[PDB]
């Protein structure tokens, strides 16, 4: 068994885990977003776009 | 690991033997289609030996020779050329139908390169020598070839006058059946 | 060439169908050859008095390796066989059986020139 | 082309005389219709064996010279059946083998039904028509039409 390939990509799972709405659904996710804002990150979440 | 050069045998040319024989058959077919091809020295020497074998087989002109050359020689446009133009061209030559001229090294791998061409053709690079050299009957060689059992082996036209008195006859035509 | 721990068919009626060479008498440390005496062990009996499991003395009469002669000729046998011997250099068998008993032998083996069906 | 013509003449000579006709008389029969054709018996035998291998004629034993009929030296009687057969053997033996094969097919299907499988292998139906076949039909119709 060769390791190293733990990242199996999937857009549904990526948006459903680290998206905006699961971050906003819980209070501590909202303080995660708030300290992302206080640090000054250009990308707030993995699914943000314009 | 078997010794091929140093113990007169065929080159290996970095190939398995079935690939090696197929590559030589392709190159002899290419050599007689275009009469001068350019390649590395090892393939050039192997091509020269194979060309002597194939050209003599075409010079026999028999049905078994045609059958053997039919598998050896691929094109079929050039099977006709080997059995007709090449056979008439070298009908009296005792081997050495091909010359080799070295041409330097090639760019992709710095391998030595040789030009291999058929001799005695319009477009060759050195004058050929006659295959036969008519003897003086007033010299030492002719008397050695009389006391010892040697034939005359004189230069000849394609049909000598020794068949002229048979072919002139109107009763030896059979009408073409 | 009969190496140690080989097998061979003893041909006489001494009571041994097969034997294993377990040593060589002389300084011959490589193989045994026709005309040599070796120590053999009977593995399988013929059911008669010489039962299986004895350690006796045997002389090899024929082999599947070529036996070279000085003139340049050699004799090739299709079987590797031997004949048992006693402590007096004599075969315990009454006669060497003709089933595999033809050999070339004249050195002091004149007793073996009467046991065999035919020599040469 | 000459080999095609000579084989056709050998078949027509075997066809005109509807009798078992061994190699000797088929050679003489093709020669005696106009040394015009069939110079040797060996060429006639080569043509007749090729016609037999392509199921255009067949062979039978020769009485008084049987020599085990599978031996190639055996003279063979040629019958010249009218149409080219789809198979090589005697039609009664072919029918017996077909009945045996059909019963074997039923037995294998029944054994495949006791196991969890279909009786016969089910395969998807395919499409074989195309533009090339339609245009090839148009070319063929015009070619025969002229």
């Amino acid at each position: 068994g060769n390791r190293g390939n733990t990242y199996q990509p999937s857009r549904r799972k990526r948006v459903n885990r680290h998206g905006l709405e699961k971050r906003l659904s819980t209070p501590q996710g909202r303080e995660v977003l708030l300290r992302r804002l206080r640090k000054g990150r250009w990308r707030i979440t993995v699914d943000s776009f314009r | 690991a078997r010794v091929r050069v140093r113990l007169g045998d065929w080159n290996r040319l970095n190939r398995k033997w079935q690939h090696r024989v197929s590559m030589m058959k392709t190159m002899v077919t290419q050599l007689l289609e275009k009469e001068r091809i350019r390649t590395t020295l090892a393939k050039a020497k192997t091509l020269q030996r194979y060309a002597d074998k194939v050209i003599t087989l075409g010079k026999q002109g028999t049905r078994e020779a045609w059958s053997e050359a039919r598998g050896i020689v691929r094109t079929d446009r050039e099977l006709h050329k080997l059995f007709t133009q090449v056979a008439l061209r070298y009908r009296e030559r005792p081997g050495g139908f091909t010359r080799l001229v070295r041409a330097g090294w090639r760019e992709r791998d710095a391998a030595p390169v040789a030009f291999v061409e058929l001799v005695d053709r319009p477009g060759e690079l050195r004058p050929a020598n006659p295959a036969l050299q008519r003897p003086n009957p007033l010299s030492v060689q002719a008397w050695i070839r009389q006391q010892l059992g040697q034939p005359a082996r004189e230069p000849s036209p394609l049909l000598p006058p020794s068949v002229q008195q048979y072919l002139r006859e109107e009763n030896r035509i059979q009408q073409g059946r | 060439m009969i190496p140690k721990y080989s097998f061979l068919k003893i041909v006489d009626n001494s009571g041994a169908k097969l034997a294993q060479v377990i040593g060589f008498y002389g300084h011959q440390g490589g193989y045994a050859s026709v005309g040599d005496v070796v120590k053999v062990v009977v593995k399988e009996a013929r059911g008669e008095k010489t039962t299986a499991g004895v350690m006796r003395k045997a002389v090899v009469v024929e082999q599947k390796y070529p036996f070279h002669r000085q003139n340049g000729s050699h004799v090739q046998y299709l079987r590797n066989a031997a004949v048992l011997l006693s402590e007096k250099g004599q075969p315990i068998g009454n006669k060497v059986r003709s089933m595999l008993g033809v050999e070339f032998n004249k050195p002091r083996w004149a007793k073996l020139k009467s046991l065999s069906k035919r020599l040469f | 082309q000459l080999r095609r013509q000579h084989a056709a003449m050998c078949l027509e000579a075997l066809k005109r005389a509807d009798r078992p006709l061994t190699a000797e008389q088929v050679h003489e029969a093709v020669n005696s219709t106009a040394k015009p054709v069939l110079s040797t018996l060996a060429y006639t035998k080569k043509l007749l064996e090729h016609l037999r291998r392509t199921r255009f004629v067949y062979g039978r034993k020769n009485p008084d010279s049987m020599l085990s009929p599978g031996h190639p030296d055996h003279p063979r009687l040629y019958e010249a059946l009218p149409f080219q057969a789809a198979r090589y053997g005697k039609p009664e033996t072919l029918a017996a083998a077909d009945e045996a094969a059909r019963a074997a097919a039923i037995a294998k299907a029944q054994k495949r039904l006791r196991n969890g499988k279909a009786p016969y292998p089910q395969h998807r139906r395919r499409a074989r028509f195309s533009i090339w076949q339609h245009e090839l039909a148009q070319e063929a119709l015009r070619e025969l039409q002229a």
Binding site: - | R77, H80, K81, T84, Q85, L88, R89, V101, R102, A103, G104, V113, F115, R121, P122, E124, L125, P127 | - | -
Partner: protein, 71 residues
């Protein structure tokens, strides 16, 4: 299977003697086009020589021959 110390400039130069190339003591020079090669090798226009003017071969007359061109 591993160097224990660092090789010095003098020791490195001594070790690198096998890497150097020997000078060639002969050259075949074409007087016209100034080309340079070995005496056993063709270096005219058929081989690689873009400077060839054909003056390297000074005589080539061969008009007569007769054969069957296979077509």
């Amino acid at each position: 299977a591993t160097p224990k110390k660092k090789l010095s400039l003098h020791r490195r130069g001594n070790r690198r003697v096998w890497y150097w190339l020997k000078r060639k003591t002969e050259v075949a020079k074409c007087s016209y086009c100034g080309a340079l090669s070995g005496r056993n090798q063709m270096f005219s226009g058929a081989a690689g020589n873009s400077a060839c003017t054909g003056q390297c071969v000074e005589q080539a007359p061969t008009p007569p021959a007769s054969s069957y061109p296979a077509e």
